Symmetry: none
Subunit: 172 residues, 4 copies
DNA sequence: TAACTGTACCGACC
DNA sequence: GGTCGGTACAGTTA
DNA sequence: TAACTGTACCGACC
DNA sequence: GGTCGGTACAGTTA
């Protein structure tokens, strides 16, 4: 009967719709049906509530990346899954959370797996043309991830598939 | 003008912290003015935010005009877009671009820029060359946002190199 | 109930000062509670003011039940109106009655007393009896407001003599 | 010229229609089309603006009282004017000021004429029938002055005259 | 017995 | 003239 | 030399 | 996230 995960989904859904500044116990109570004491029961500070949201979303993204990877040892094969989940499996909440995370080490740490085991390493890229060609993909996937929140002019699915394919065809 | 100075301080303030802790009070510190003198200049919070959207939107239209010496070709515009995104737009611009949907006034302030300098998505599905330019656009947005969504700041050396590689890609 | 002790302190504050300077902070000083403890109990200012109106309008109704010994007739209600106006109603009720038009909720809290106890102003051009009762109502009202609009508080004895004079005048 | 009496009149009219707590430099600037600076020139503080208003209205009244007293030796004649100018020639502003007056020595003092040279005397009426029947009249007049602001039942012009006549008939 | 809900407060801040 | 993030603890429902 | 207007700024309170 | 009561001038209009 523990509604601890349901609260987080509700909180994530809420920040997509509205935003972080406006997420508070009262407004999460209103949205969960729960009472404020109820929420405090699982998340005794706002800091825990946010941690849980970061953790929850980083774990969605890790599970998503590992599932769609055909072979986990092939670098290019995992870069392809980074490109794909960035174009389809991450939305507004993740972006707001990525941006909020630097604001506390706890939140940074919650994202360490998926920023250190899936995003390609920046090493001597000044003078390595292949490595820099692998980073160009990463940069382009990141632009397709944030595109609809920064351009005010959403891509339709069809345009987004077309651009996803273009970022893929560019994998070495 | 005292107005532009206050707005400049508010922009650095949000780069360092966020919109949500931008308050008349926290802004009175950073600017040295009293909470009340601040309100004299920006009589509501919405005005203060409208100021900041407008200042940044304008600065962006400025720098990308002082950088293209041929406004004609979508390609020279496109060059201007990549460089400004790569090297002279930071965290505050990203913060206000995210926040902009929350009021029509905010959207309206970026309207000039967001459609005038931004390549056209229009028929992208069938035009390979139009997908080659949007790929550049996307890579630029990638470098613009890079350090604020991966816990890893690029060094100036790395950043310059990725700018070039993107600059290469240009049709 | 803690609500009722809070209203009671607010009633005495406005007796000493005014409604205009009655604020959550100034009522927190006077009650011992914190600003937000008070807001827990009355969540908006409207609610606090509605509470004070309700409380006085209802004490006056009660104080005018254990005094009138035959709710039946116009005259025994009038005697009661006169006595309560003369001696168990002071500056807070005057202040609240002046403020009460500022909102329908407040007027409404004074319905029971304002018509059901106070004699009617109806049919008063032509009925001598009805003018002799309203004369008594005006005098009672005059004694009620006396200390607060004339720079001269009456003593208890002066007040009883006058009370008694209005009471004689009863048709 | 000098807008000074004109500002006070506007301020009086303002609070009649609205009230005292809302009367401010800003709101009085709007009502007068003057500037806050303009108002502060005549009235260096709000205190000085309320006194102006207390002073002005007590003189309108004192003027009105002696304007309508035929024989000012006669204690019953002045009692008649009191009643008359109470039932006919004072309105809301006048009530709000009276009620506010005791909150400051200057305000009390500005009402000293009309309260001393005109209001009959509470002097051993405990044992004196005539004196107390003179107070009764004063008492009913005060009641007709406050009626409309205390009872939520504005009297018609006609009923107000009817009641005024009745208090007057109660005279010597 | 864990998962709540309600009630009464309060300091920093908007 | 409030909100917001707590804190404290008693009383109820799966 | 008086009666304003506008512009910037602030502490206490709401 | 503000209003209310100023303070402090410099310039303007009769």
């Amino acid at each position: 009967t523990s509604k601890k995960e349901m609260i987080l989904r509700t909180a994530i859904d809420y920040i997509g719709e509205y935003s972080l500044e406006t997420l508070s116990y009262d407004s999460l109570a209103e949205a969960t049906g729960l009472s404020k004491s109820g929420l405090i029961y699982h998340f005794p500070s706002r800091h825990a509530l946010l941690l849980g949201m970061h953790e929850l979303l980083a774990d969605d993204w890790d599970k998503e990346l590992r599932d769609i990877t055909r072979d986990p040892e092939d670098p290019l094969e995992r870069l392809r899954a980074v490109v794909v989940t960035l174009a389809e499996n991450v939305s507004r909440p993740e972006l707001l959370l990525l941006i909020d995370a630097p604001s506390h080490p706890d939140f940074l740490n919650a994202w360490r797996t998926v920023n250190h085991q899936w995003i390609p390493d920046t090493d001597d890229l000044e003078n390595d043309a292949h490595k820099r060609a692998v980073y160009l993909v990463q940069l382009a996937a990141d632009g397709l991830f944030v595109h609809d929140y920064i351009h005010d002019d959403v891509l339709s699915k069809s345009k987004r598939q077309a651009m996803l394919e273009t970022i893929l065809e560019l994998i070495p």
